[PDB]
Amino acid sequence: INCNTSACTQACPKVTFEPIPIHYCAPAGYAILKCNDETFNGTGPCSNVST
Amino acid sequence: ENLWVTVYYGVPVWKEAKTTLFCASDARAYEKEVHNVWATHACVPTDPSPQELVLGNVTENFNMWKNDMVDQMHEDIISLWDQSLKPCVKLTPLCVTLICSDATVKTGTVEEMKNCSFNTTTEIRDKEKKEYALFYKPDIVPLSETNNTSEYRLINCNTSACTQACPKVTFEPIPIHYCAPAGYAILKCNDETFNGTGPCSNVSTVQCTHGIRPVVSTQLLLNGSLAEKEIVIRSENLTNNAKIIIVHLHTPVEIVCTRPNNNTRKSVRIGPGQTFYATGDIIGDIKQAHCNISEEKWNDTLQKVGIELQKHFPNKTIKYNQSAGGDMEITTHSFNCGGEFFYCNTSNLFNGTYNGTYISTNSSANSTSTITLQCRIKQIINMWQGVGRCMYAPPIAGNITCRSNITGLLLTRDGGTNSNETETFRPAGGDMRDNWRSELYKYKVVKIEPLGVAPTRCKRRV
Amino acid sequence: ATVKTGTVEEMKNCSFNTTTEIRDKEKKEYALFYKPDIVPLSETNNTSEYRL
Amino acid sequence: AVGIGAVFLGFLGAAGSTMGAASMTLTVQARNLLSGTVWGIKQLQARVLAVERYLRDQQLLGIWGCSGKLICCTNVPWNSSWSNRNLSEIWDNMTWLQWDKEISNYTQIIYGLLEESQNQQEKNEQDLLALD
Amino acid sequence: AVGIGAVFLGFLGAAGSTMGAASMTLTVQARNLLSGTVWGIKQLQARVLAVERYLRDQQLLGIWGCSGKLICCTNVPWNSSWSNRNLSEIWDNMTWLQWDKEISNYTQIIYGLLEESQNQQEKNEQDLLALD
Amino acid sequence: AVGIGAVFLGFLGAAGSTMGAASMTLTVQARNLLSGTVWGIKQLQARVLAVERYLRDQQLLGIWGCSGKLICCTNVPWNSSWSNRNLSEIWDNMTWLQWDKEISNYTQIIYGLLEESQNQQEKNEQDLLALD
Ligand SMILES: *[C@@H]1O[C@H](CO)[C@@H](O[C@@H]2O[C@H](CO)[C@@H](O[C@@H]3O[C@H](CO[C@H]4O[C@H](CO)[C@@H](O)[C@H](O)[C@@H]4O)[C@@H](O)[C@H](O[C@H]4O[C@H](CO)[C@@H](O)[C@H](O)[C@@H]4O[C@H]4O[C@H](CO)[C@@H](O)[C@H](O)[C@@H]4O)[C@@H]3O)[C@H](O)[C@H]2NC(C)=O)[C@H](O)[C@H]1NC(C)=O
Ligand SMILES: *[C@@H]1O[C@H](CO)[C@@H](O[C@@H]2O[C@H](CO)[C@@H](O[C@@H]3O[C@H](CO)[C@@H](O)[C@H](O)[C@@H]3O)[C@H](O)[C@H]2NC(C)=O)[C@H](O)[C@H]1NC(C)=O
Ligand SMILES: *[C@@H]1O[C@H](CO)[C@@H](O[C@@H]2O[C@H](CO)[C@@H](O[C@@H]3O[C@H](CO)[C@@H](O)[C@H](O)[C@@H]3O)[C@H](O)[C@H]2NC(C)=O)[C@H](O)[C@H]1NC(C)=O
Ligand SMILES: *[C@@H]1O[C@H](CO)[C@@H](O[C@@H]2O[C@H](CO)[C@@H](O[C@@H]3O[C@H](CO)[C@@H](O)[C@H](O)[C@@H]3O)[C@H](O)[C@H]2NC(C)=O)[C@H](O)[C@H]1NC(C)=O
Ligand SMILES: *[C@@H]1O[C@H](CO)[C@@H](O[C@@H]2O[C@H](CO)[C@@H](O[C@@H]3O[C@H](CO)[C@@H](O)[C@H](O)[C@@H]3O)[C@H](O)[C@H]2NC(C)=O)[C@H](O)[C@H]1NC(C)=O
Ligand SMILES: *[C@@H]1O[C@H](CO)[C@@H](O)[C@H](O)[C@H]1NC(C)=O
Ligand SMILES: *[C@@H]1O[C@H](CO)[C@@H](O)[C@H](O)[C@H]1NC(C)=O
Ligand SMILES: *[C@@H]1O[C@H](CO)[C@@H](O)[C@H](O)[C@H]1NC(C)=O
Ligand SMILES: *[C@@H]1O[C@H](CO)[C@@H](O)[C@H](O)[C@H]1NC(C)=O
Ligand SMILES: *[C@@H]1O[C@H](CO)[C@@H](O)[C@H](O)[C@H]1NC(C)=O
Ligand SMILES: *[C@@H]1O[C@H](CO)[C@@H](O)[C@H](O)[C@H]1NC(C)=O
Ligand SMILES: *[C@@H]1O[C@H](CO)[C@@H](O)[C@H](O)[C@H]1NC(C)=O
Ligand SMILES: *[C@@H]1O[C@H](CO)[C@@H](O)[C@H](O)[C@H]1NC(C)=O
Ligand SMILES: *[C@@H]1O[C@H](CO)[C@@H](O)[C@H](O)[C@H]1NC(C)=O
Ligand SMILES: *[C@@H]1O[C@H](CO)[C@@H](O)[C@H](O)[C@H]1NC(C)=O
Ligand SMILES: *[C@H]1O[C@H](CO)[C@@H](O)[C@H](O)[C@H]1NC(C)=O
């Protein structure tokens, strides 16, 4: 199938592909805020907002 | 009345710098397609204003041929250029036995279009297809050890492998308004007369240089700045025959170049992914490639230069010969108009030599008479003598037209012990450094050195 | 080599076909090599055929 | 014309205005000296070096006293070998650029003297704090 | 609950506690703003930029005085155009977050004024040092 | 022999000279701790980290007072649990290296106390500035 496209690879056979959670952290000078609110339509004035 | 020492932080003094500058690209070449624009994708856009200073009484010593900045410029161009072409078009598969034949022959300008048949690898590696590509003159080399047969080879097969070009990338000079790093500043001469060196009087500060468009060219330098008041003839040593004279003209001259023949384009898939581009067939009639230049303005220029040049070479006639001879890269003018590569034969441009009176005599006329140079185009070139970076041009369809306002000149000097009544100048060039040196000279880079000392007499109670 | 002295035997004259500047053209060339890099070809039977 | 912005946001504008002029302006010059694939290294190096220079200068100012005022008296007298000019000549006619061409000698002598007067002060202060 | 660690090691905890609260705590906030293949560039850039911001702020504090105290009086009076609230309203009811939405205007006016009051002070000090 | 250059341009030379010796020399040590394809990252990281450490220490000094003197009194008394030696023993016989092996405990206690004495001072100063 790929001969009329671009060349392909297989996989490095040793590598594991399994989702690992990344707990992304802020750089110095920055902070992250989060909504602890339910109801939240995806936008708007969240009330109790944790750091 | 005893004097006591104080320290002053932040005093306005400096020393010569040895650092680097950066883009400062023009912030107008930026659009989504910037990733397809050479030397813009990689750069940071800026929009700074000119500086007011004027450092008043301050004077400073400049020297164009010692400004190391030019090397930085050279080195980056080499490396930016090279890097931008890595992820594409390796042409090694092309170096196969090639079979070819003559156009019609007849007119020399038609003969050159060699139909070149060859066997190329198909999307399936096992399957092979017989295909032809139109090629002309130098890239097609008679096969080594054959005997005037139809068998040919590609020019680079005995060298190193070449690439074509990423087909998406635009190569057009964009001025870069190079800016200083914190702790540094740039100074510039606003002086005329300036021989390329010496004690410039009113010396402005610069935050960022006026942007300069990189150009690859030799001999005549196009798309450059003009002298503000008069022609400036500049040289590291006018009495040293090994040096090249740089000339900044006061007024522009116009050059109009073109490629008349409608050219079609085709492409060939080689193995997976990558396609190769080549001329299908020049689709129209085949006419010459040329550069129109007004005679009037060119004969006005040669004498005006002769007048100024006469100042350093008094009581002598100024004569203009042709190049010493060599490969077209050495003797011809080079243009990249439209992205195609032209090599144009300078004679008879610099054929003349006027009596050392250089009388500025001309007259009104309805004449449109021009001087026309004829051009030879190439497909494979050593970009900046980069044989190890050799590349094949993509073909461009339709007819190319190209202006503009020129020129800076690169000239050398000749004449033996058998003259000294006249001196002979020749076209010269090939070092990219001079192409930029020509404009870079305006600026000097310095470092700010805060914290100095002076007596005051005042004392701290403690 | 000649064989004879063990110190001479080792100099195996090794002929092979190599790709020329033209990929289509092939040239027969020889390189002097000695002992270990030259390995009897797998699955041959004491023949003149070897592998790297 | 110009003004402080061009003179010190930009640089060296006062260089021609003689050093007495500096007494009213050497502020901005300091703040604008602290501004901010492979090119990432070139840029990071440039940024880092600017920071290092800045901080090293601050360290010297700290060591000598006083030091947060940018203009400090360090209570070190001038050696007569350095007193070949009048103060009026120095402050009204000479530039920093000019002074710096000659006063450039004996740089470390001054630095040594400044460091030491401060060291002595500190001991004297500790002795007084101990007594007090 | 929380406490200073969460409020200022972490950030902005006092934002809701009204600005008078800040008078006892704006310390830690400052220290925790100075913390520390191709990803090496991303990380170096982040580190460098944090440093540059930090230092640039310190430079401004230096220029205006006083400055090592983090809370300084700069001896510049308020323009009446900025005096539409009582101090009690400002300090007890308003937050820094809130104040900062309105007082955000005329930022450079203040900075200009602060720089200049310090410049004048320094000249006055040098004149007194010269007299003394 | 040696001298300050080798001792503090170089490092730790006074480590064996007992801590009283330090009272005349801990200057240079500080300034020389702020000195300056893929290897570009290694070098940039090294440079950046040195800067970050330096600045973080300066921040702590600032917070506690006094702080530009490098040797400061912070007006915090010693807890008797830390007073198992005479001052003469500490200053004349012990080294910094040695002291630091034992006094290493309760590090944050001291830092907490230093930060707080300064916080109180600052409030007292503001109240006096308000009265004055
Ligand atoms: C770069 O510079 C070069 C010059 O170095 C320049 O080349 C010149 O290009 C121009 C483009 O116009 C050419 O101009 C054409 O020249 C012919 C030749 O005629 C000359 O000679 C005859 C006798 O042999 C004389 O009678 C005549 O007066 C000229 O001296 C002209 O005939 C062309 O004009 C006519 O033809 C056009 C269409 O082809 C018509 O549209 C136009 O109306 C004219 O018609 C005349 O002839 C017709 C014949 O069918 C007749 O029916 C009409 O009634 C009328 O009589 C035109 O002037 C010029 O020759 C080129 N010179 C040379 C030697 O190369 C390049 O163009 C320039 N390149 C650029 C621009 O980059
Ligand atoms: C360069 O050489 C190639 C041949 O290697 C030329 O292509 C060939 O052109 C001829 C004449 O146009 C083709 O002959 C014709 O074939 C068609 C069917 O394809 C037939 O219907 C016509 O009656 C006639 O026989 C020939 O097939 C074609 N070969 C191919 C497809 O490669 C090419 O035209 C030459 N180019 C130039 C510009 O000289
Ligand atoms: C020197 O300066 C002149 C004047 O700016 C340049 O002329 C310009 O050449 C470019 C070629 O890239 C022209 O852009 C082209 O426009 C056509 C449409 O007309 C488009 O089809 C092309 O692909 C390309 O975008 C540009 O319009 C033209 N400018 C003018 C006003 O003529 C010249 O290219 C510069 N360099 C040289 C070698 O002269
Ligand atoms: C450099 O310019 C000079 C001066 O134009 C050139 O010399 C002249 O060239 C022209 C054109 O070839 C000559 O005119 C022709 O002469 C021949 C022979 O008599 C005649 O058959 C042609 O019909 C035409 O009249 C001219 O005689 C000749 N000499 C002079 C003094 O004009 C010179 O060739 C040019 N050199 C270069 C490098 O092109
Ligand atoms: C390794 O084997 C190669 C052959 O694959 C040897 O090269 C060959 O050496 C012989 C004897 O020197 C050459 O024969 C001679 O040829 C010339 C003309 O080329 C002729 O004038 C003489 O009369 C004689 O026939 C043979 O041509 C040559 N073959 C080539 C060029 O590859 C090589 O000498 C051997 N090397 C060692 C060290 O054993
Ligand atoms: C490859 O072949 C398939 C089947 O015809 C076609 O759908 C696909 O577009 C082709 N890809 C290319 C780029 O030729
Ligand atoms: C140059 O020096 C003269 C004499 O001291 C002074 O009047 C003039 O203003 C100075 N110019 C500048 C801008 O430095
Ligand atoms: C291409 O392949 C054809 C058929 O296999 C063959 O006749 C022809 O000689 C080959 N041409 C070249 C130059 O390889
Ligand atoms: C390739 O062949 C040409 C033509 O003989 C020759 O001039 C050139 O030097 C050769 N290059 C190499 C490196 O063999
Ligand atoms: C330098 O001298 C020229 C003389 O024409 C003057 O126009 C210019 O303003 C001076 N300096 C600057 C700022 O260009
Ligand atoms: C002019 O240029 C020459 C070299 O061509 C140089 O030696 C001289 O110093 C320059 N300046 C003067 C005074 O003309
Ligand atoms: C250029 O110089 C050569 C001699 O090297 C001479 O033969 C030729 O005629 C000259 N060309 C002219 C006159 O421009
Ligand atoms: C350049 O043109 C002249 C005059 O037609 C000719 O004698 C010379 O051989 C040409 N040189 C080239 C580069 O072909
Ligand atoms: C919110 O504001 C009210 C009224 O000023 C105050 O009593 C309460 O403690 C505040 N809550 C917080 C945690 O900011
Ligand atoms: C080692 O300690 C002894 C006793 O206090 C002292 O006399 C000697 O100078 C010290 N040596 C050094 C160089 O630390
Ligand atoms: C123009 O100058 C050239 C010498 O370069 C001379 O041969 C020619 O006759 C001159 N023509 C004019 C326009 O006077």
UniProtKB/TrEMBL annotation, chain A:
Glycans are attached at residues 4, 41, 48. Palmitoylation of the transmembrane protein and of Env polyprotein (prior to its proteolytic cleavage) is essential for their association with host cell membrane lipid rafts. Palmitoylation is therefore required for envelope trafficking to classical lipid rafts, but not for viral replication. Highly glycosylated by host. The high number of glycan on the protein is reffered to as 'glycan shield' because it contributes to hide protein sequence from adaptive immune system. It is found in: Host cell membrane; Host endosome membrane; Virion membrane. Disulfide bonds join 35-46. The CD4-binding region is targeted by the antibody b12. Transmembrane protein gp41: Acts as a class I viral fusion protein. Under the current model, the protein has at least 3 conformational states: pre-fusion native state, pre-hairpin intermediate state, and post-fusion hairpin state. During fusion of viral and target intracellular membranes, the coiled coil regions (heptad repeats) assume a trimer-of-hairpins structure, positioning the fusion peptide in close proximity to the C-terminal region of the ectodomain. The formation of this structure appears to drive apposition and subsequent fusion of viral and target cell membranes. Envelope glycoprotein gp160: Oligomerizes in the host endoplasmic reticulum into predominantly trimers. In a second time, gp160 transits in the host Golgi, where glycosylation is completed. The precursor is then proteolytically cleaved in the trans-Golgi and thereby activated by cellular furin or furin-like proteases to produce gp120 and gp41. Belongs to the HIV-1 env protein family. This is Envelope glycoprotein gp160. The gene is env. The chain holds residues 182 to 232 of 847 of the full protein.
From TrEMBL, chain B:
Disulfide bonds join 23-43, 88-166, 95-157, 100-116, 179-208, 189-200, 257-291, 337-402, 344-375. The keyword Membrane applies. The keyword Transcription regulation does not apply. Glycans are attached at residues 57, 107, 115, 119, 158, 195, 202, 223, 237, 299, 315, 321, 345, 351, 355, 399, 405. One of its GO terms (molecular function) is structural molecule activity. Residues 323-333 are annotated as: CD4-binding loop. The CD4-binding region is targeted by the antibody b12. Transmembrane protein gp41: Acts as a class I viral fusion protein. Under the current model, the protein has at least 3 conformational states: pre-fusion native state, pre-hairpin intermediate state, and post-fusion hairpin state. During fusion of viral and target intracellular membranes, the coiled coil regions (heptad repeats) assume a trimer-of-hairpins structure, positioning the fusion peptide in close proximity to the C-terminal region of the ectodomain. The formation of this structure appears to drive apposition and subsequent fusion of viral and target cell membranes. This is Envelope glycoprotein gp160. It comes from Human immunodeficiency virus type 1. The chain holds residues 30 to 489 of 847 of the full protein.
Automatic annotation (TrEMBL), chains D, E, F:
Residues 1-21 are annotated as: Fusion peptide. Disulfide bonds join 66-72. It is a single-pass type I membrane protein. Residues 101-132 form a coiled coil. It comes from the Viruses. Residues 19-132 form the Retroviral envelope protein GP41-like domain. Residues 42-60 are annotated as: Immunosuppression. It is found in: Virion membrane; Host cell membrane; Host endosome membrane. Glycans are attached at residues 79, 86, 93, 105. The chain crosses the membrane at residues 1-24. This is Transmembrane protein gp41. It comes from Human immunodeficiency virus type 1. The lineage of its organism: Viruses, Riboviria, Pararnavirae, Artverviricota, Revtraviricetes. The gene is env. The chain holds residues 509 to 661 of 860 of the full protein.
